[PDB]
């Protein structure tokens, strides 16, 4: 489709130039066989007239006819209908000028599939329908098709500067033409004097001659200076509309007068140009057009194919329960957010992920069951009532920042906010995060996991210390420092740092007055010799030192007896002491997987003990005060290296777990029917070590 | 046309420049032909054979116009150049030898037939919706069977072009006589064009017949012929600027080297590889046409391409809902997937999340993908002849939750170094050769890295245990090895294993037992099968083991067994089968725990009393024997269930069988049994699946008990 | 076309050289026909009836311009040569026959329809998609299979109803036979008779009862351009000529009625192609002058075996 870029004054000239070759061919074909000068010689040698006797032969005559037409006849009489070929194939060769070179002829064939394929798209209808399924996924391929066309023609400017060569070129061809045929009309004449000197041929020297073809090739030479006259204007008008409106620049106001979009952006330069040209042609397919071109429109569209596509029956579908016993709705690498998910109002928790460029509405305000929000690596957007909504309602947040920017800052605007999830990474600019340092607005946080490759606890922590409580800290290899910022910890109660590489438990710890509990996991504590001020710690009954590197345990555990939780599993601890279960109070403690040698018998002050596992030990020796301490309800003693389980073991009441799976044994006593809360899940052993029961044991045994 | 994707820019300009010529050669041909003449005037006064040159009156020639016509003929024909008169016949010659030579490249059939190959499949190739997919880069089975078929004829077609540059050296050639002619013409021309003149002195000597021999003449079309040629000449030039232009495109640049770097780099494949000779040059004249069919063809040659193709389509042949139309279960009545001779692992069966048993069968070289982590409850893994090329996330899964590993190979580089690289392995059979150079029990040292193993099947033709094996047998449970009869040195050190349970010599050709079998504790399941043990003497040193508890001899030469035998009472699945008992012993009924008794292929004498004394035994085979009578004693047990007694010379059933309840299936084609007892129809449990019997003693029987037995199989 | 397959290198040429002769003819009958003349002015002087021709005044004859007109017309007639006066006719008819010959090949029915279900099933054989499966050496489709097994059936019947008779061949021989005797006919005559296309003829053709004179010098207009177009033509007849004997060496370097297809059977799979004869091998040579990969499509069809992979792949 070629034609459409033609404007009138396209098709006028060429059909111009078609005339001028009509025009060119006749006057060449007179001048071939019709063209002939009869010359005669002057001076020759009731009223009776006579013909003067000139006595001349016939060749003489063609003689003088051909002298006279070489030499006397001017070049322009001869040599019009050639010049008048040669000019107009001039102008067609030049008519197509802005038609020919590849990458313009590409630009022409790109544009106009463009803008016939949307023209046969009836998002265009929808859409004007809307401002006055598979179509839609077409639409959005348009759409991206556009963009990209966009992208590919609308920085040059190559096809109006050719444009504007072509018509300065015909423009002053044109002057040209004019300027010469205007002078050079009058030389055609019919009755011409030859002067030829042919006096020793012929006996004459002056010839009055006739140009027999010289009538028809001055109307033949007007005829032509009228078409080009007519061409000219033609090409002046074209140059006065090139030139009297910048046609680099193509303005969509006029849309804008009736269309209630404004979005739209003005394209420039070959864009503008050559939308122009298919407003020369008619304005439809611009105005049409012009839907197309902004993004909002783009944005529309994508909302209204989410909302085709998600269902409030698949969002019913969709609807499931979290960690936090909530109503979960995981939305998964999607477009962008549907405002259906927003029309159910019994949820509890939105699950978003990798969901960019989505900005929240405020038809957020009709769900107020939201209690949690899971931001995955999301860029989210946001308005004015959605902040005053979530401000009042939203108190649960996890959000996952794979990249900073995905993390968006709107979070700090809040106050209700409690528990916050901050899983991702960070880089080692690590105090430059302002985003950090603004929960100062939030009130009432209390929860705050950071599972990122943080080295320095930011002061954001040293401002929200008043409200805040429970830290979850995964660096993962990386060396946590600058331990100042968790000294002014105040109200902290719950401190979880895992892999932080903290050589040593920092006076930070022991800052803290109220910590309920610690955990120091994945970090390389070879030796405890601190713990003098953990007795500070008043609340401190769970220490979860698992992992961990502790080769042997000192008397300074003495400091705090109020613990209750001990977990030291997989530690390097050789012998344990005489000093550890002194703090009575100790109910929990874990010591599983380790390499104890043995166990001493001061084991038996433990009676508060409701849990002792020393799993995966050397220990040969279990002597019998841990079996007379009856409050240990587990007691975890698997794969040690002991002998004979012991005979007098139902005498432990409250012995709800015991397992000693692994252990080199030979045969089970008959008073496991004694022992009220041991079962074969508890008693956890390899099953040869099972099929020892007595028969009538086993009739006991099998109904408990 | 359909050429004109071939035609560069200069190749079209030469067309519509010898186009034109060819208008102005008929131009003038036709102004020859028809207009050109001469006409000649006699010199009156002639001094020395020369125009003396020395109102006014005409002068009178008294010559007749054929006297003039005379004149005009014979100084046209003898004293006009001949430049004048036959240039519109030399610029029609030049130009048709330009044409002929412009169109001898598709005139010639070898290289017009390789121009339409060439042409023919690049058309469709720019047309094929695989091209836009691969730019692009779920597709129609049409769609990819058309796109794998345009791939096999570009490789054939390829293979056809690069052998001969014909196509090359013809156009080369084609430019270099265009050359060599524009250089011809514009030579001559501009020598010779100064010689089409108007006025022009003629001395032919006709005074005989005319009268005069000087006569000064004028060539009508003299200075249109002037023009002709001065406006011609430019052309040629034209021409030879063009020509020119494309000779230096023929030498800046190797056209039998066309490097795909500058495509590679940009788009996503980078192998694509460098053609030559004929195809080269034709890929580089689609670049001077239109740089976007190269780059629409690139895709269709490279092999990653290639690759992608193959694995859509196979996405399309095997999918998940065909998988689980062929999804099958194994022996431990887990869910396998036998995928036999595949050139690959589709991602279809990645994509599951319950499969358990991956089987991989004659696969070439595969390269396992990290999605095998989805396969949430996979633990076996079978690997028959395929070599497996596998990484990391797929090592982790697998080393979380893969606890088998199933190895067939008849090669060491079959067998990969991966899979010692685990962390649950449990169960693993290791079948082909393990003994080799610096391989012997070395393809599979990270066997010391697997503490977790209890399953060790080794069909590998083994001549030797390696103690590493021994080692891991604290937790190992079972070894069974297949030799296709090859002894092993034991050597006594095999007593490291404690926790094995199961020691099963499969065809070892032992025909002794070693202390090391009855010094294991723990032994339960002993199968000397097929070790030719003439006499077996061993079992009085078994009851230190308090754990045998089932002595399976079957497949052996044993001639006789001791009376002693009756020492044992705690066997229950004693299976005797396929020897050269003589006869079975009352001592052998001893055993009051025997519950599986199989005396199948054996030359006993009869069948004694004393099998009744086997209270809870369920299946007897006393198969292919010398047997006459079953004793009432035998009835007296409730729970015989398959009595596979067939192919024997039994006599007959006593009616003491009316005591049997617990019949399930019975083998009684062959026998000597001349009718059937109705209390063979009496058992309960037995069914027509297990009355495996003939029919006509079954019609013996009355019709009515036979509707009882039809209506408890059918209702 | 369809027939441009069977038309090898010297077939074209042949054909083009004959439209360029076919060209010159037209030419040359055009200027036969409106410009061919001769001017011919009598001898005053004389002796014994020739041309004596022993301020200028010309040389009065008496004569009128019917007069003349009747003398160049006598003289044309009797003593101007025949062949410079027919020479374009005589190209025109050579021409023609050159073409007949060429063209008969394609409009006797018999041969016609040959060359025509040859031509049309190697077009569907090269359509044919087990064409390129064969020549790669999976998934077959119904109609595809139906489509592979008629085009084998339709092959093995065609091979046998054209391989009994060769006229196909014989006819081509005939050809090129009375082609290359034309051509040698038309260069010897031609060459014999160039020299007498001259400029000045002299004429003796007794008009004296009529005109008043016995001999008359006649020039001839249009005879040098005449000769040259004589040499164009000879030259051009020797071009056909030199392809002519190239193509008949063609035929007697070896029998074209005996196709071998060891080549292929050692290069492809299938190495029970028979060696086929007579107008199927002539046939097959044609397509083999023109593109050998349309045999190498062809051949997969004839063998025996890929019918064996055909019947099996067709049962899966
Ligand atoms: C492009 C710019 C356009 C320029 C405008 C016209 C200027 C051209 C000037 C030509 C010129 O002056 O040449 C002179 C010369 C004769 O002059 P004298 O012998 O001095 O005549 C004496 C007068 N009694 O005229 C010419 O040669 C005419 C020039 C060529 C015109 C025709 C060309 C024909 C070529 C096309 C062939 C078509 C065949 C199909
Ligand atoms: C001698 C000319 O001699 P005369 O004609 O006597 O002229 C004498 C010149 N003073 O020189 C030559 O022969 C020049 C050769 C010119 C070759 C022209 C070739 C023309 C070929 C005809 C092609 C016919 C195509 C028809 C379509
Ligand atoms: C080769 C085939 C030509 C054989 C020619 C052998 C000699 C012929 C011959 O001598 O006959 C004369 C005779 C010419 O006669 P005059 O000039 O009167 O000669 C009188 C003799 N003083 O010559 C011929 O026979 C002419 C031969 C040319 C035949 C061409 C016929 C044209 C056919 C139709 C044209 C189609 C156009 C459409």
């Given at each position: ?10 098709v ?24 002939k ?41 001869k ?6 070929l040669?000019?107009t ?47 839609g996924?077409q ?12 992208l ?26 004019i ?37 028809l ?7 032509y ?18 030139f ?5 620049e ?12 404004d ?22 397919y ?30 019913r ?6 960690a ?20 159910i ?64 800052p ?46 320095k ?12 409580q429970?830290?979850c ?20 109660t ?33 030796s ?26 000192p ?21 344990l ?14 010591l ?58 139902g ?33 956890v ?6 099929e ?13 | ?56 009156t ?56 390789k ?9 469709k ?20 069977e ?27 050639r ?18 010779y ?5 108007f ?31 001065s ?6 030039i ?12 023929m030498?800046?640049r190797?056209?039998?080297?066309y ?15 460098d ?9 580089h004249?689609?670049d ?50 036998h ?20 089987k ?35 090592l ?12 067939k ?7 990969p ?28 040292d990270?066997?010391?890295?697997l503490?977790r ?10 001549s ?15 070894l ?33 037992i ?9 032994l ?14 061993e ?8 754990r ?24 229950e ?20 725990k ?15 009393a ?15 024997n ?8 035998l ?31 019975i ?13 063979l ?32 199989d059918?209702?």
């Open positions: 489709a070629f034609r459409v870029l033609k404007p009138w004054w396209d006028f000239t060429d059909y111009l130039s078609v005339a001028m070759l009509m025009i060119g061919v006749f006057g060449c074909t007179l001048q071939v066989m019709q063209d000068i009869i010359c005669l010689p002057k001076r020759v040698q009731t009223v009776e007239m006579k013909g003067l006797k000139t006595d001349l032969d016939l060749q003489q005559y063609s003689f003088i006819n051909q002298m006279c037409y070489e030499r006397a006849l001017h070049w322009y009489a040599y019009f209908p050639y010049l008048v040669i000019h194939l001039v102008f067609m060769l030049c008519s197509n000028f802005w038609f020919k070179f590849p990458g313009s002829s590409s630009k022409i064939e790109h544009f106009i599939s463009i803008l016939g394929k949307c023209f046969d798209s009836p998002w265009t209808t929808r859409a004007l329908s809307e401002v006055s399924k598979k179509e996924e639409a959005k391929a348009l759409f991206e098709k556009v963009k990209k066309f966009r590919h023609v609308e920085e040059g400017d190559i096809l109006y500067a050719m444009y504007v060569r072509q018509t300065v070129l015909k423009v002053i061809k044109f002057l040209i033409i300027a010469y045929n205007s002078a050079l009309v009058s030389k055609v004449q019919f009755t011409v004097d030859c002067n030829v000197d042919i006096q020793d041929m012929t006996g004459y020297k002056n010839f009055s001659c006739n140009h027999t073809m010289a009538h090739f001055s109307k033949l030479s007007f005829c200076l009228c078409f080009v006259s007519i061409y000219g204007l033609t090409c002046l008008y074209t140059l006065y509309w090139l009297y409106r910048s046609l680099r193509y303005s969509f106001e006029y849309v804008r007068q009736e269309t209630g979009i979005d739209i952006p003005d394209v420039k330069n070959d864009f503008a140009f050559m939308l122009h040209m298919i407003d020369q042609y008619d304005p439809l611009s105005k049409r057009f012009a839907v197309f071109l902004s993004e909002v429109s783009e944005n529309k569209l994508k909302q209204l194919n989410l909302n085709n596509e998600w269902t409030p029956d698949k969002l579908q969709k609807l499931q329960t979290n936090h016993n909530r109503l979960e709705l995981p939305l998964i690498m999607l477009s962008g957010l549907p405002d259906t998910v927003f029309e109002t019994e949820l509890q928790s939105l699950k978003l992920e990798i969901i960019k460029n989505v900005m929240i509405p405020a038809t957020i305000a009709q769900l107020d069951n939201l209690q949690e929000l899971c931001l995955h690596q999301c860029s989210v957007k946001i308005h004015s009532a959605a902040l005053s909504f979530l401000k009042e309602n939203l108190k649960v947040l996890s959000v996952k920042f794979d990249d900073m920017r995905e993390l968006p709107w979070m700090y605007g809040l106050r209700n906010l409690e528990e916050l999830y901050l899983v991702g990474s960070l880089s080692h600019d690590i105090s430059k995060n302002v985003t950090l340092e603004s929960l100062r607005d939030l009130k009432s946080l209390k929860i705050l996991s950071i599972k990122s490759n943080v080295s606890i930011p002061q954001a922590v040293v401002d929200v210390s008043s409200h805040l429970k830290m800290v995964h660096n993962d290899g990386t060396k946590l420092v600058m331990l100042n910022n968790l000294k002014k910890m105040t109200n902290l719950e401190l979880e740092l895992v892999h932080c590489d903290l050589e040593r438990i920092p006076h930070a710890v022991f800052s803290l007055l109220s910590l309920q509990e610690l955990d120091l996991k994945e970090n390389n504590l070879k405890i010799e601190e713990i003098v001020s953990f007795q500070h710690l008043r609340k401190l009954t769970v220490l979860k030192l698992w992992y961990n590197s502790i080769a042997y345990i008397e300074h555990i003495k400091k705090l007896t109020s613990l209750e939780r001990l977990f030291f599993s997989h530690n390097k601890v050789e012998v002491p005489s000093h550890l279960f002194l703090c009575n109070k100790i109910r929990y403690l874990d599983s997987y380790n390499d104890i040698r043995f166990i001493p018998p001061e084991i038996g002050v433990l009676q508060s003990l409701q849990y002792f596992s020393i799993t995966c030990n050397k220990v040969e020796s279990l002597p019998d005060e841990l079996y007379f301490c009856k409050k240990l309800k587990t007691l975890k003693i698997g794969k040690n290296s002991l002998s004979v389980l012991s005979p007098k073991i005498n432990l009441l409250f012995l709800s777990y015991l397992d000693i799976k692994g252990n080199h044994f030979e045969v089970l006593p008959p008073e496991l029917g004694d022992c009220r809360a041991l079962k074969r899940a508890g008693l052993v390899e099953d040869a070590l099972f020892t029961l007595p028969s009538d044991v086993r009739e006991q045994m099998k109904a408990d | 046309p359909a050429y004109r994707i071939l035609k560069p820019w200069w190749d079209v300009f030469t067309d519509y420049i010898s186009i034109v010529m060819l208008m102005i050669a008929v131009f003038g041909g036709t102004l020859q032909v028809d207009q050109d003449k001469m006409i000649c005037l006699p010199c009156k006064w002639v001094t020395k054979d020369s125009c003396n040159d020395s109102g006014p005409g002068i009178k020639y008294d010559l007749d116009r054929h006297q003039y016509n005379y004149v005009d003929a014979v100084c046209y024909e003898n004293r006009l150049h001949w430049f004048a008169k036959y240039f519109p016949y030399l610029v029609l010659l030049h130009t048709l030898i330009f044409l002929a030579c412009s169109n001898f490249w598709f005139k010639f059939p070898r290289t017009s037939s121009l339409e190959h060439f042409v023919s499949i690049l058309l190739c720019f047309d094929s919706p695989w091209t836009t997919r691969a730019l692009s880069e779920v597709l129609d089975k049409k769609e990819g058309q796109a794998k078929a345009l791939f096999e004829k570009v490789k054939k077609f390829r293979t056809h072009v690069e052998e001969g540059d014909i196509v090359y050296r013809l156009y080369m084609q430019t270099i006589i265009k050359v060599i002619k524009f250089a011809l013409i514009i030579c001559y021309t501009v020598y064009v100064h010689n089409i003149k006025d022009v002195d003629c001395t032919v000597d006709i005074e005989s017949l005319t009268g005069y021999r000087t006569y000064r003449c004028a060539h009508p079309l003299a200075t249109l012929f002037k023009i002709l040629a406006f011609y000449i430019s052309l040629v034209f021409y030879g600027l063009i020509c020119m232009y494309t000779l230096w495109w030498l800046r190797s056209l039998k080297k490097s795909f770097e500058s495509i590679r780099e940009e788009s996503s494949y980078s192998d694509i590889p053609v030559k000779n004929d195809f080269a040059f034709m890929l004249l689609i001077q046409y239109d740089p976007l069919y190269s780059k629409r063809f690139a895709v269709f040659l490279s092999e990653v391409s290639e690759n992608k193709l193959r694995q859509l389509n196979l996405n399309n042949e095997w999918t998940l809902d065909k998988l689980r139309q062929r999804l099958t279960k194994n022996a431990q009545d887990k869910l396998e997937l995928l036999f001779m595949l050139s690959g692992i589709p991602d279809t069966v990645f994509d599951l999340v319950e499969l358990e048993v991956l991989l069968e004659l696969i070439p070289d595969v390269t396992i993908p990290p999605s095998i982590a989805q396969l949430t409850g996979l633990k076996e893994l079978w690997l028959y002849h395929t070599a497996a090329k596998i990484e990391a996330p797929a982790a899964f697998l080393r979380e939750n893969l606890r088998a590993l199933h190895i190979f008849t090669d060491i580089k079959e067998i170094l991966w899979i010692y690289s685990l962390k649950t392995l449990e169960e693993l059979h290791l079948t082909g050769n393990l003994s080799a150079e610096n391989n012997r029990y070395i393809v599979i990270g066997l010391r890295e503490k193993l209890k399953v060790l099947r080794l069909k590998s033709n083994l030797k245990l390696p103690q590493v094996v021994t080692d891991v047998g604290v937790h190992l449970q079972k069974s090895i297949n030799n296709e009869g090859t002894k092993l040195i034991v050597l006594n050190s095999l007593k490291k294993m404690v926790n094995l349970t199961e020691l099963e010599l499969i065809r070892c050709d032992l025909e002794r070693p202390h090391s079998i009855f010094s294991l504790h723990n339960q399941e002993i199968d000397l099968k097929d070790n030719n043990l003439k006499t077996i003497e079992i009085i040193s078994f009851q230190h083991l308090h045998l508890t089932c002595l399976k001899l079957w497949y052996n030469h044993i001639a006789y067994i001791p009376i002693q035998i009756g020492n044992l009472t705690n066997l699945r004693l299976y005797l089968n396929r020897n050269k008992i003589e006869k079975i012993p009352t001592q052998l009924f001893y055993c009051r025997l519950r599986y008794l199989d005396l199948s292929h054996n030359n006993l004498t009869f069948l004694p004393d099998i009744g004394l086997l209270q809870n035994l369920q299946n007897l085979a006393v198969t292919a010398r047997i006459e009578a079953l004793p009432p004693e009835f007296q047990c409730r729970k015989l269930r398959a009595l596979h007694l067939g192919n024997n010379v039994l006599q007959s059933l006593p009616s003491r069988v009316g005591e049997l309840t617990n019949l399930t299936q083998e009684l084609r062959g026998n000597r049994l001349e009718c059937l007892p109705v209390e129809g009496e058992c309960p449990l037995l069914k027509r699946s297990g009355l495996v019997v003939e029919e006509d003693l079954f019609s013996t029987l009355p019709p009515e008990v036979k509707e009882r037995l039809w209506r408890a059918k209702e």
